[PDB]
Amino acid sequence: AIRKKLVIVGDGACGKTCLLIVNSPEVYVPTVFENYVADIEVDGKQVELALWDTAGQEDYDRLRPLSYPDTDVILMCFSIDSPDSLENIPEKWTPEVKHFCPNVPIILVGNKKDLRNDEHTRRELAKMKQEPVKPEEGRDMANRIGAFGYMECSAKTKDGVREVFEMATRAALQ
Amino acid sequence: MLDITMKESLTTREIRRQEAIYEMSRGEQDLIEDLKLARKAYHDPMLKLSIMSEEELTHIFGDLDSYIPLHEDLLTRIGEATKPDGTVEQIGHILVSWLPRLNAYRGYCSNQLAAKALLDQKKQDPRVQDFLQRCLESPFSRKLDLWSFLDIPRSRLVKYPLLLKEILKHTPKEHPDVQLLEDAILIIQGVLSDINLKKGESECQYYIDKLEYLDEKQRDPRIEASKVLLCHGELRSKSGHKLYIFLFQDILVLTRPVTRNERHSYQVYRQPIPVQELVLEDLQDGDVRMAKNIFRIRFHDPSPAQSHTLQANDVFHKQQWFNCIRAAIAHHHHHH
Helix (H) or strand (E) holding B203: helix B177-208
d(CA A25, CA B2): 13
Alpha-helical (H) ranges within chain A are 16-21, 83-88, 94-100, 119-127, 135-144, 161-172
- Rounded Cα gap, residues A108 and A144, in angstroms: 11
Determined by X-ray
Q: How far apart are CA A50 and CA A7, in angstroms?
A: 8
Neighbours of B146 (CB within 10 A): 21
SS3 A160: coil
**What residues contact residue B169 under an 8 Å CB cut-off, 6+ apart?**
B16, B20
Q: Which of A133, A168, A131 is nearest to A149 (CA)?
A: A168
CA dist B269 and B83 (Å) reads 66
Q: Euclidean distance between the first and final Cα of chain B, in Å?
A: 57
Determine phi and psi for B223, rounding to 5 degrees.
-65, -60
User: Given CB atoms, is B118 within the 8 Å cutoff of chain A?
Assistant: no
Amino acid at B221: P
Q: Domains of chain A by range and CATH? A: 1-174 (3.40.50.300)
Helix, strand, or coil (residue B103): helix
Within 8 A by CB and 6+ apart from B30, the residues are A34
- Using alpha carbons, list the distances in angstroms from residue B157 to A98, B90, B98: 26, 22, 13
Contacts of A106 (CB under 8 A, 6+ apart): A73, A74, A76, A94, A97, A145, A146, A147, A148, A171
Cβ burial, residue B151 (10 Å; 0-12/13-18/19+) = buried
Note the Cα B255 to chain centre separation in Å: 24
**Cβ contact A145–B151 (<8 Å):** no
Q: Which residue of B has its CA nearest to A31?
A: B163
Q: Find, among B263, B262, B239, the residue nearest to B254 by Cα.
A: B239
Cβ distance B317 to A57 less than 8 Å, yes or no, reads: no
**Chain B residue with the nearest C-alpha to that of A102:** B313
Residue B5 burial by CB count (10 A; 0-12/13-18/19+): exposed, middle or buried? exposed
- Give the three-class secondary structure for A104: coil
Please give the resolution of this entry in Å, rounded to 1 decimal.
2.0
* Rounded Cα–Cα distance for residues B30 and B57 (Å): 23
Comparing CA positions, the residue from B236, B238, B246, B242 lying closest to residue B256 is B242
The domains of chain B, with CATH numbers, are 12-209 (1.20.900.10), 211-335 (2.30.29.30)
CB of B177 closer than 8 Å to CB of B91: yes
Of A28, A32, A103, the CB nearest to B162: A32
Distance in angstroms (rounded) separating the CA atoms of residues A13 and A19: 12
Under 8 Å CB pairs connecting chains A and B tally to: 96
Q: What's the CA angle centered on B184, arms A84 and A77, to 5 degrees?
A: 25
